[PDB]
Ligand binder design. Structure first.
Ligand SMILES: COC(=O)CNC(=O)c1cc(C)on1
Lengths: 412, 412
């Protein structure tokens, strides 16, 4: 019968810091991680900024010999996973290694690696493709390389549900532990899609903010002047642990994961329905999964991408689900500061939702200067709001109409 | 407790045919689907052959205009899925659409699309990249497009576990139903990695057979002259259904899915351990999951990729799990005929395992002319072997040492 699941470790690379505490300090101070991109020439692109990871040192984590074989999204995933395991205090042994697995996902995976090997193939021929091209680029290799380096013999897999990946990875990892398939899971996601194909591809769809002259003001969820999402890089990992297993080893418990929802919009390949019908179905699934009254929800870490249709759909979903309580809860988009980490968005936002519970503070939605028509909830505009938070919800919505919701609450 | 899960519809594209019955007919006749790859200049490549899907008509499923938006791997996944749903006779309604989900995966995803768009990008800059590049290339769009087309509002996700994708997709979809998160799932995988990038990538790792003179003899699992795997394209989909839901509407039930195991080798990025310790833990996990004794297994559809170390690891794992019964069961690699469909391998091989149960025949391992040292099991060399099969295993062992096993049983 269904076991309880708690968070005992977290790890992060974001546009705001090389770990969780540095990233969280940025979140609470309303600081932007968005800047003109330096690692390539974007003069021919309509968008030339994003959330880069600044000063990442892979030799904190991996031999330069192993790192050279791996796409940045895999390096980023391994870094956040290592931080999370270290933070958990968990010791891997012959007695428990079969009961510890990993589910680290990505939306796009090794697009930089694939681009560069495509350049080699076309200009110089197949004999110049890296021998490490496949294992260094495919999405399951965060799970793979993490299991090899730590000796994790539990369930080993990877989700790819575009901008929902991080949320789905965490939720399904919790189900693994809930149903007895594992006692410990490392789950989250990683993304580094800032290459010609990434910025060019989202650019071709006209999905990106083109605010090149004021990059820090680009991501403005629910603001009347929003013009698309900001593309950002990084990783979130959490150590999920069966409750009694955590208690037995004296673990520090950040929070309990009580609810997970999924739903499909079945509406459009890329556009959310205007009324947030799918987001609403997903949140209700997650709240029934948690055995909660919707009035218990204090804080929502919104998907809040800063797209016209996305932001309004979320307001409509929240008002539909929560009715009058919609005006009492606090809802914010940390994407206002981090931009959109795509497959990693749900992973870092789950960590922010947990730290919201730890510190009893709603992160701000920065740049919310002129809330749009009907965006009249507490969106924690401009500045972090200390407040009572017992239950925190983290939402993600992606291409293919894929929805995920995680429900966390304080553990005593 | 846990609900029972049955297979009520199947769909496939393979190197042997454009549906299940034509593919199965080739399997039972020992036909090869391997041939030199056409409409592609492979002169500079060390491998020039593979399993292509021959005569595929996407307009049987989609308008030309919607097809143009989607990578071949998504077209193939949609074709198998549409087939499987049609085969099931399921009627989607407002009363059940929230209870019907999708988990169709891919190991490598949109290589062909990435290749064609790199060309535009490098030659003409980012403004020639297709607007549909991202939604048309990401692995979750088979699940996405299927859900939108059929109005499926159930769990919507996609796995990517390299060569284990199809096995994990089906297993985790079976869990969704067993644990009451859905009544129906469409699950499996699809792959189209015969671009330069796939043939070049695996080729740079020296993972592929280079037997260009005799492509039909290249895939020779457990034969002493094997020189690596053969790259193949296609898709498999199964309609998974709760037993009582299937019975109530009078569905034709092919077989029951009684077991699913997962494990990680935690050994090497690309190679299995010599003794197949990981594959052994995974098969034991699947049999424990099914409540079955190893002696009850009659038929194993091996991973059997025709790599030196992969094939010998699976023999060691089968002898270790089954001891004095390892010689009584039959184990074959249909990859002798189909080649290795990577993320689709587990989906098409689960269908072959279900059809082994329906028709009471073990498919052959063709090309097994000279079994290698220790390869002394009943590997169904050369020709199909009619026999009693109450219980069939399907194994997948992928990059990152990720393992999956499905256990199917006759239903009456
Ligand atoms: C149309 O009104 C709503 O959707 C809000 N009503 C709920 O049913 C709801 C369900 C759960 C769980 O939390 N809120």
């Amino acid at each position: 019968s269904r076991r309880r699941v708690v968070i005992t470790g977290m790890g992060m690379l974001s546009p705001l810091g090389l770990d969780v505490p540095s990233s969280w300090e940025g979140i609470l101070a309303g600081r932007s991680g968005i800047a003109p991109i330096e690692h390539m020439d974007l003069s021919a692109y309509s968008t030339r900024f994003g959330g880069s990871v600044k000063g990442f040192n892979v030799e904190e984590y991996l031999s330069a010999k192993e790192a050279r074989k791996l796409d940045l999204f895999i390096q980023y995933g391994l870094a956040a996973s290592f931080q999370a395991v270290r933070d958990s205090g968990l010791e891997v042994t012959d007695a428990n290694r079969e009961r510890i697995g990993v589910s680290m996902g990505s939306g796009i995976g090794g697009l930089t690696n694939i681009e560069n090997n495509c350049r080699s193939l076309f200009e110089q021929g197949p004999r110049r493709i890296s021998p490490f091209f496949v294992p260094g680029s495919i999405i399951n290799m965060v799970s793979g390389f993490l299991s090899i380096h730590l000796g994790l013999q539990g369930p080993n897999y990877a989700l790819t549900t575009a901008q929902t990946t991080g949320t789905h990875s965490i939720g399904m990892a919790a189900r693994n532990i809930a149903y007895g398939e594992a006692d410990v899971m490392v789950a989250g996601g990683s993304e580094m899609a800032a290459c010609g194909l990434g910025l060019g591809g989202f650019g071709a769809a006209r999905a990106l903010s083109t605010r090149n002259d004021e990059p820090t003001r680009a991501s403005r969820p629910w603001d009347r002047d929003r013009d698309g999402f900001v593309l950002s890089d990084g990783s979130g990992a959490l150590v999920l642990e069966e409750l009694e297993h955590a208690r037995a080893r004296g673990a520090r418990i950040y929070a309990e994961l009580v609810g997970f929802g999924m739903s499909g919009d079945a509406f459009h390949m890329t556009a959310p329905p205007e009324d947030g019908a799918g987001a609403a179905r997903c949140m209700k699934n997650a709240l029934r999964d948690a055995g909660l009254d919707p009035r218990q929800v204090d804080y929502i870490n919104a998907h809040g991408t800063s797209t016209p249709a996305g932001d309004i759909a979320e307001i409509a979903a929240v008002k539909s689900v929560f009715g009058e309580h919609a005006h009492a809860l606090s809802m914010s988009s940390t994407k206002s500061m981090t931009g959109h980490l795509l497959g990693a968005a749900g992973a870092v936002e789950a960590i922010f939702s947990v730290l919201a519970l730890r510190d009893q503070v709603a992160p701000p939605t920065i740049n919310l200067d002129n809330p749009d028509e009907g965006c009249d909830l507490d969106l924690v505009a401009h500045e972090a709001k200390p407040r009572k938070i017992d239950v925190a919800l983290s939402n993600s919505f992606g291409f293919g109409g894929t929805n995920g919701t995680l429900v966390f609450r304080r553990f005593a």
